[PDB]
Amino acid sequence: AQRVKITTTATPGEIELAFEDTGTGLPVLLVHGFPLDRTMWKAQREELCDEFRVIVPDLRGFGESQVIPGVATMEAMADDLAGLCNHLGLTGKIVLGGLSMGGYVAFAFARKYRDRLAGLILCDTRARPDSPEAKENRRRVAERVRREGPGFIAEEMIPRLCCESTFRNHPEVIEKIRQMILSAPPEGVAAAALGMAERPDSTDLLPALSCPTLVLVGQFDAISPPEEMEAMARTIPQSQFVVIPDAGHLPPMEQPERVTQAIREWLRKVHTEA
Ligand SMILES: [Cl-]
Ligand SMILES: [Mg+2]
């Protein structure tokens, strides 16, 4: 892993990002969820790198990246990704993938940097904005986590994040997720919670997308359910919809091989169509 100060068009203009960059060829940038870190995507980075160049950053406020107090908007996170790609000399097109909050970041990137996208991978995510109650919940989480840290988030979220089969067959995956959450910087968690509350509605963005899009969901995802994601895919042109069996909200970790293969075979199509 690497740590680099990048130039970003978002406040504060410069930020230190930690990231992995593994493989050669077509760049595929994978964005973790909330309140996780780059290691969420480890299996896909380690396996897809035989064929693609896989770049996996810690978002601002997460993992080993710099924490920027206040509000970390989805736009700002996307701006940081554009800055990272600029740093790396990936100044043309990329494939951008994200899970859940990382999907929100991908929408923000697509709004602003459409000419930089060869493709989008939207995993276990939603196009709608937060409802008023959800926004209030963000705010209450932000104010709590600043002072108490993310233990309460792990307690609340872990039963909702993975399916029963993962708890039974892969307790080590559950523990790895728990440690990601417990290690998340408190102010980074807070800033991202507030940022999620202010993200725009991406409903009308969907029909305007201009690249192939893979829409991936766990069969048992309790947070961004498959029926909702299917409906989302029906408004995205050039979509492919994949349900990963025997996974909840974190397919990349729960069913790593199946996720890697779905992404690999779709990337080959995108490449052929391009
Ligand atoms: Cl990793
Ligand atoms: Mg469609």
Side-chain angles (χ1 to χ4, degrees):
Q2 291 181 243
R3 203 153 187 283
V4 177
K5 188 175 69 168
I6 62 153
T7 298
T8 179
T9 61
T11 305
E14 181 166 72
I15 188 172
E16 295 193 353
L17 298 180
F19 64 99
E20 297 284 6
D21 177 5
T22 315
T24 65
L26 168 71
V28 181
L29 199 162
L30 300 173
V31 184
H32 67 81
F34 174 88
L36 310 179
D37 62 53
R38 70 190 193 246
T39 71
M40 198 206 74
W41 286 116
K42 182 180 178 281
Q44 290 70 43
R45 181 181 55 73
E46 292 185 332
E47 295 298 334
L48 291 170
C49 65
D50 63 356
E51 188 169 353
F52 312 103
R53 177 176 181 179
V54 185
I55 301 159
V56 192
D58 288 327
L59 291 168
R60 64 164 62 191
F62 294 95
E64 301 184 296
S65 287
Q66 186 178 352
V67 176
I68 309 300
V71 180
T73 64
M74 303 300 93
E75 179 179 14
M77 292 180 184
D79 291 331
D80 296 344
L81 300 181
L84 177 60
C85 293
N86 290 345
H87 164 73
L88 293 173
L90 297 173
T91 58
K93 291 185 170 172
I94 67 168
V95 171
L96 180 61
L99 182 139
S100 196
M101 181 182 78
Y104 307 159
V105 175
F107 292 136
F109 189 99
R111 284 179 192 277
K112 191 164 181 177
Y113 302 106
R114 70 194 282 202
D115 293 347
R116 306 196 62 174
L117 289 174
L120 283 161
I121 306 168
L122 301 172
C123 304
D124 306 88
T125 192
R126 310 183 65 249
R128 307 100 274 202
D130 282 349
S131 71
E133 188 172 358
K135 294 180 177 177
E136 176 62 10
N137 174 75
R138 299 307 182 186
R139 288 189 292 262
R140 297 169 186 188
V141 166
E143 309 335 305
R144 194 161 167 197
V145 74
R146 276 208 201 92
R147 175 182 174 181
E148 309 189 6
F152 76 99
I153 299 172
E155 287 183 18
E156 284 174 13
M157 281 186 77
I158 288 171
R160 310 181 176 283
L161 282 169
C162 299
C163 75
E164 271 86 346
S165 287
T166 300
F167 288 89
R168 180 176 64 258
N169 294 318
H170 292 287
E172 77 289 355
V173 167
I174 302 304
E175 180 61 14
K176 191 171 187 177
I177 297 160
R178 190 197 309 287
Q179 295 299 325
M180 296 169 194
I181 296 173
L182 296 180
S183 296
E187 175 59 24
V189 177
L194 296 182
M196 287 189 284
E198 54 184 75
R199 80 186 181 281
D201 188 359
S202 291
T203 297
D204 296 345
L205 174 62
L206 303 187
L209 293 170
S210 57
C211 60
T213 299
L214 177 61
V215 181
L216 180 149
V217 65
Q219 182 181 11
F220 302 126
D221 187 332
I223 293 169
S224 50
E227 298 82 359
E228 185 181 3
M229 293 209 74
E230 183 176 35
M232 193 188 75
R234 281 33 177 132
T235 72
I236 296 172
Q238 300 192 293
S239 62
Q240 183 177 329
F241 180 63
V242 171
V243 179
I244 302 293
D246 299 326
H249 187 63
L250 298 174
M253 295 180 77
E254 298 181 73
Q255 289 290 340
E257 300 94 348
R258 289 178 162 89
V259 169
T260 295
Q261 171 69 34
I263 293 175
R264 185 185 303 277
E265 73 199 11
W266 177 83
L267 287 168
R268 291 175 177 176
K269 290 183 180 61
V270 168
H271 181 254
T272 298
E273 273 33 87

